[PDB]
């Protein structure tokens, strides 16, 4: 407690000694309060909006640009649950770490991430200026030697829920735990259940492969506030990755887990305006990319235990018998890898095809681990899916699409209002017309490679690419990102969907976009197309006028028409 978190608080208290007041009317119940001291909207992308006029009247799209679960506690699991988790976590770190060696990530790797503008969750006005200043690295090394001493001084979170930190503390986490993402621990090759690095164009093929396994329904239960339901027992099972480490790495990693995760300190603004300095032991508080890997790990653990419950491996969560323990251990060594293969897990998001539908009502371990299901009553059996093309995963569903030549594409899809509404939004200040145009181009190229099968998005993508100068490079201030490039989109399409695609045996290239199919006209409408509306027909007819409006605003530049690629603009 105060041994570990004190110095961090005491250092903050000193710097605001003239304004340090113990607020007696503090709203916290489950967070520990310590003291208080005196102390960013969505912006519309104009290029994308001018080329999507029909959507200017559609509520869902328009309203996307307009505009307390942290203060809950999580009961400690029973003895049987805690034993199931410890055994499963032990086994899972071994299976993951069999083909992978834990290592420290380097200043040089970290600096490359800041120079390439990667999201680290920092709070020198820029990351670039800090990694170039040798002073900072002296601050880092001071904390570093404090961590080797088993102590902490400057690793405090800043809730604004994304918890930001000073770049230093971010480096110390990346140095100790970055290997999990940097070395692809949660790849489908190393993990069997994971999809890390897969890409949207892979995920449908993966869920079709899971479908092929004999068993029951596909389950895709969402957890009600996953990050808030991470227990101290969860954090202790995650910490066992240090059992596979040695030297400066093992001790440094041990310090991230014990000083920053298993104990924390946070600064949250309250408008009554005072900064509160609060602490707690449990719940997920770490960088997004580490949080992704540890969420995947604990989700993989939880779903193997739910599978064990459905299969009758153990009878009660109250207490595991020594005989139950060896059976659990034997199930893992015998069938564990096959069971991990029956799942697709992306952080808190899962799809599970269990051995049979007993899984649907195997709820005692899942509820006792704190992973309570969203939108369903505590003890009501899960609703399963009887077709892989209906299963929700990573905010998508997936269609099976037949090319005129008989080859099979499995494509990603979601309601089209969501896609158009997101592409119309840009975050942050000081965007030039050129910067705004290059972000619109990034969305257009993504639609050409991921959503080419939606009539409205292939047309709007061709319009935006025709309105932005051909040689201007697509941008994104903040999954694979193959659409990010200046190469021909047809060349990239052929690479992604034909050349690289392990599910496509015939490698015969496509030589025209008209060889690339759409969903059925009725299916397109079901997934939110405006085909059949008068607004959409006038937009399609008159698209060159919209393109020319945006060209006139950007000015005299090198422009390439990409509308002739489509049959209806081809003479």
Ligand X SMILES: CNS(=O)(=O)c1ccccc1Cl
DSSP 223: B
- Residue 266 lies near Zn ion (rule: CB under 5 A): no
- Angle of CA points 158, 164, 169, to nearest 5°: 100
Instruction: Tell me which of Zn ion, ligand X, Cl ion, none is bound by residue 413, counting a contact when its beta carbon lies within the kind-specific cut-off of 5 to 8 angstroms.
Output: Zn ion
Q: Does 535 bind ligand X (CB under 6 A)?
A: no
| CB within 8 Å of 409: residues ≥ 6 apart | 400, 401, 403, 453, 497, 517
- Helix residue ranges per DSSP H, 149-283: 167-177, 179-182, 188-191, 200-211, 232-239, 247-255
Preceding-residue numbers of gaps in the chain (C–N over 2.5 Å): 39, 67, 123, 160, 272, 478
- Does the footprint of Zn ion cover residue 203 (CB under 5 A)? no
- Contact residue for Zn ion among 84, 152, 543, 550 (CB under 5 A): 152
Stretch that binds ligand X, among 91-99, 201-209, 477-485, 524-532 (CB under 6 A): 524-532
- In this structure, what are the phi and psi dihedrals at residue 36, rounded to the nearest 5 degrees? -140, 145
Is there a binding annotation on residue 225? Answer: yes
* Binding partner selected for residue 11 from Zn ion, Cl ion, ligand X, none, CB under the kind-specific 5 to 8 Å limit: none
**Smaller CB separation from ligand X, 190 or 544:** 544
147 known member of a binding site: yes
Report whether 465 belongs to an annotated binding site. Answer: no
Write the CA distances from 571 to 464, 565, 566, integer angstroms: 21, 11, 10
Joined tokens for residue 487: 């190469």
Under a CB-based contact definition with an 8 Å cutoff, are residues 559 and 470 in contact? yes
Helix axes 288-310, 232-239, angle to 10 degrees: 100
- What is the rounded distance in angstroms from the CA atom of residue 301 to the CA atom of residue 83? 12
By CB under 6 A, name the one of 94, 532, 557, 564 that touches ligand X.
Answer: 532
Residues in contact with ligand X, shown as a per-residue x/- string from 502 to 521 under the rule CB under 6 A: -------------------x
User: 397 or 455: whose CB is closer to ligand X?
Assistant: 455
What CA–CA distances, in Å, run from 425 to 47, 53, 443, 485? Answer: 10, 15, 11, 21
Strands (E), 101-222: 158-159, 163-164
Tell me the per-residue interface mask from 438 to 477 with ligand X, x by CB under 6 A, - otherwise: -----------------x----------------------
Q: Whole-number minimum distance, CB 540 to ligand X, in Å?
A: 6
Does the annotation place 319 within a ligand binding site? Answer: no
Q: Is 348 annotated as a binding residue?
A: yes
Q: Is 385 in the site for Cl ion (CB under 5 A)?
A: yes
72 or 390: whose CB is closer to Cl ion? 390
106 lines the binding site for ligand X (CB under 6 A): no
Nearest residue to the partner ligand X, using Cβ: 532
**Annotation: binding site for Mg(2+):** 222-223, 348-349
**Annotation: binding site for Zn(2+):** 143, 147, 152, 155, 397, 399, 413, 527
**Annotation: binding site:** 143, 147, 152, 155, 222-223, 225-227, 295, 348-349, 374, 397, 399, 413, 527
Interface with Zn ion (CB under 5 A): 143, 152, 155, 413, 527
């Amino acid at each position: 407690n105060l041994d570990i978190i004190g110095k961090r608080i005491e250092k903050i208290k000193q710097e605001h000694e003239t304004s340090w007041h113990y607020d007696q009317d503090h709203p916290y119940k489950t967070w520990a309060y310590h003291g208080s001291y005196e102390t960013a909207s969505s912006m519309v992308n104009g290029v994308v909006r001018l080329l999507t006029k029909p959507w200017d009247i559609i509520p869902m799209v328009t309203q996307m640009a307009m505009t307390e679960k942290v203060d809950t506690r999580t009961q400690e699991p029973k003895e049987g649950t805690k034993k199931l988790m410890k055994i499963t976590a032990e086994w899972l770190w071994k299976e993951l770490g069999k083909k992978k060696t834990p290592r420290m990530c380097t200043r040089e790797e970290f600096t490359r991430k800041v120079r390439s503008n990667a999201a680290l969750g920092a709070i020198w006005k820029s990351a670039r200026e800090a990694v170039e200043d040798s002073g900072f690295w002296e601050l880092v090394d001071k904390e570093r030697n404090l961590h080797l001493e088993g102590k902490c001084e400057t690793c405090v979170y800043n809730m604004m829920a994304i918890w930001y930190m000073w770049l230093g503390a971010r480096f110390l986490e990346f140095e100790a735990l970055g290997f999990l993402n940097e070395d692809h621990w949660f790849s489908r090759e190393n993990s069997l259940s994971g999809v890390e690095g897969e890409g949207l164009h892979k995920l449908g093929y993966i869920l079709r492969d899971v479908s092929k396994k004999e068993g029951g329904a596909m389950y895709a239960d969402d957890t009600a506030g996953w990050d808030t339901r991470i227990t101290l027992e969860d954090l202790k099972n995650e910490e066992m990755v240090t059992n596979h480490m040695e030297g400066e790495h093992k001790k440094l990693a041990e310090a991230i887990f014990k000083l920053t995760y298993q104990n924390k300190v946070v600064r949250v603004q309250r408008p009554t305006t005072v900064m509160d300095i609060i602490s707690r032991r449990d719940q997920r508080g770490s960088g997004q990319v580490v949080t992704y890997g540890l969420n995947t790990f604990t989700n993989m653990e939880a779903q193997l235990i739910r599978q064990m419950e459905g299969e009758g491996v153990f009878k009660s969560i109250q207490h595991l018998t020594v005989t139950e323990e060896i059976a659990v251990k034997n199930w893992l060594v015998r069938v564990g890898r096959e069971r991990l293969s029956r799942m697709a897990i992306s952080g808190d998001d899962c799809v599970v095809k269990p051995l049979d539908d007993r899984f649907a009502s195997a709820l005692t371990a899942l509820n006792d681990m704190g992973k309570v299901r969203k939108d369903i009553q505590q003890w009501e059996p899960s609703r399963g899916w009887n077709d892989w093309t209906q299963v929700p995963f990573c905010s998508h569903h997936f269609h099976e699409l037949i090319m005129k030549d008989g080859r099979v594409l499995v494509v990603p899809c979601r309601n089209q209002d969501e896609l158009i509404g997101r592409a119309r939004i840009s975050q942050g200040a000081g965007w030039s017309l050129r910067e705004t145009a290059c972000l619109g181009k990034s969305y257009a190229q993504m639609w050409s490679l991921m959503y080419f099968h939606r009539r409205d998005l292939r047309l709007a993508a061709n319009a935006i690419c025709s309105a932005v100068p051909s040689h201007w490079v697509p941008t994104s201030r903040t999954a694979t990102h193959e659409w990010m490039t200046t190469e021909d989109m047809l060349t990239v399409w052929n690479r992604v969907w034909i050349q690289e695609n392990p599910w496509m045996e015939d490698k015969t290239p496509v030589e025209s976009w008209e060889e690339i199919p759409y969903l059925g006209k009725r299916e397109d409408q079901w997934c939110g197309s405006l085909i059949g509306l008068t607004s959409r027909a006038t937009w399609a007819k008159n698209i060159q006028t919209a393109i020319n409006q945006v060209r006139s605003l950007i000015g005299n530049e090198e422009y390439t028409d990409y509308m002739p690629s489509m049959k209806r603009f081809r003479r």
